Coordinates of C-alpha atoms in Angstrom, one line a residue:
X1 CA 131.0 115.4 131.4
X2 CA 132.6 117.3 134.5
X3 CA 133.1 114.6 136.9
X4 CA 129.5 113.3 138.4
X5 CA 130.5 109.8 140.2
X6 CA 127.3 109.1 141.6
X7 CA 125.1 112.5 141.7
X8 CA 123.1 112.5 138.6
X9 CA 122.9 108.4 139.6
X10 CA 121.1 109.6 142.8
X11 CA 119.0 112.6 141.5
X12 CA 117.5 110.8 138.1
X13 CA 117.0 107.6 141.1
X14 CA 114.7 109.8 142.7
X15 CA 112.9 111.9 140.5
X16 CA 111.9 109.3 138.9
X17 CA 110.3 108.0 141.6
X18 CA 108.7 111.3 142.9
X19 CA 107.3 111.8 139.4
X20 CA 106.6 108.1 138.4
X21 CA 105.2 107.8 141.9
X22 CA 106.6 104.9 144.4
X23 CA 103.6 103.3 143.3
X24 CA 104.4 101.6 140.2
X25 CA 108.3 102.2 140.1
X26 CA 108.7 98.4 139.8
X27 CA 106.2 98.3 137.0
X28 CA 109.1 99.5 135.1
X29 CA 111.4 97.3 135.6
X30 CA 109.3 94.3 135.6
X31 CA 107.3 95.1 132.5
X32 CA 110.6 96.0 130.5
X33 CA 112.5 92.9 131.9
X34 CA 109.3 90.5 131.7
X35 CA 109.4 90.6 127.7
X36 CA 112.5 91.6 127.2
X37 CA 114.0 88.1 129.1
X38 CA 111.4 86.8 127.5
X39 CA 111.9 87.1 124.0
X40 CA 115.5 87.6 124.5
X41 CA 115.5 83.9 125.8
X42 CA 113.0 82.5 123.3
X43 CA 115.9 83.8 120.8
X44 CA 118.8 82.1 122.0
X45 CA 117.0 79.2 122.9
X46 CA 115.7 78.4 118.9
X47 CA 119.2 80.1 117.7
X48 CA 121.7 78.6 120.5
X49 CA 120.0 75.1 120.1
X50 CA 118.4 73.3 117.2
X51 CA 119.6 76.5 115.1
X52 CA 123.1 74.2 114.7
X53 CA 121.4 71.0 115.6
X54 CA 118.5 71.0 112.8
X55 CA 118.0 74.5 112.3
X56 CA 120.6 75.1 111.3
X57 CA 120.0 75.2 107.4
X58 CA 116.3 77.8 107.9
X59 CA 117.5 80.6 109.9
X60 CA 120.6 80.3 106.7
X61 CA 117.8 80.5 104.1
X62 CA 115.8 82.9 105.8
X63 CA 118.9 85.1 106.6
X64 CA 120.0 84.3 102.4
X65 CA 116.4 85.4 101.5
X66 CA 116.1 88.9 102.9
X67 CA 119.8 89.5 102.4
X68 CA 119.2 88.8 98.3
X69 CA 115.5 91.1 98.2
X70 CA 117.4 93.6 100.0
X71 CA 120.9 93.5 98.3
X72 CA 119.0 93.1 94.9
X73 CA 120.2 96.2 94.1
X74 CA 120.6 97.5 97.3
X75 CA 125.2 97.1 97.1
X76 CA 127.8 97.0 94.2
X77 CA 129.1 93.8 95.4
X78 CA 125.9 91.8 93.8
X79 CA 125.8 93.7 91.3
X80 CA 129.1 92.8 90.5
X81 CA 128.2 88.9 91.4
X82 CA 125.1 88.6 89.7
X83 CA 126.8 90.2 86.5
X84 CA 129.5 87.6 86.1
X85 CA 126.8 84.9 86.8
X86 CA 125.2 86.2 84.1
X87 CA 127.5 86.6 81.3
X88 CA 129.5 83.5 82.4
X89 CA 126.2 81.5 82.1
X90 CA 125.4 83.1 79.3
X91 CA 128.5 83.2 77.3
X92 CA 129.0 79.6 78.5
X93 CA 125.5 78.5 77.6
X94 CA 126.2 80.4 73.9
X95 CA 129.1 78.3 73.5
X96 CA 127.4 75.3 74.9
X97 CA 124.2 74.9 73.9
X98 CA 124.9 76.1 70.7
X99 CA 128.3 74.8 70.0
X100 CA 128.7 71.6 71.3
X101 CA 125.4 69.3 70.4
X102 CA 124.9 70.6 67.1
X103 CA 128.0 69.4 66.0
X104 CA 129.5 66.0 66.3

């Protein structure tokens, strides 16, 4: 937090070769980036692709899915949603199905 440019760069460059050993220093970086390009790919390729072209309705339901089990009571704001879905049905389905087809 002094100034650095370069020095701790260097140093942590080398130690980490002098105590990881030059002998699998690009085991590192080639493990790491092997999976991680990997999956990273995999994702944008089935989200970048037929995620708007077909599949674009499943990642929305699976997204919808989790969101609802874990907003379930998990925020006010669906709370608040769910509770004027309710009484709004309800009331509505009071007035409804029992006044309106009983009479007339």
């Amino acid at each position: 937090m002094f100034d650095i440019g370069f020095s701790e760069l260097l140093l942590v460059f080398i130690i980490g070769l002098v105590v990881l050993g030059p002998q699998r220093l690009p085991v590192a970086v080639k493990t790491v980036a092997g999976w991680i390009r990997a999956l990273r790919s995999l994702a944008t390729t089935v989200q970048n692709e037929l995620t708007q072209e077909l599949k674009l309705q499943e990642f929305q339901d699976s997204l919808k899915k989790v969101e609802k089990a874990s907003l379930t009571n998990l925020t006010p704001e669906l709370k608040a949603s769910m509770d004027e879905l309710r009484q709004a049905a309800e009331s509505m389905k009071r007035s409804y199905v029992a006044n309106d087809p009983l009479e007339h």
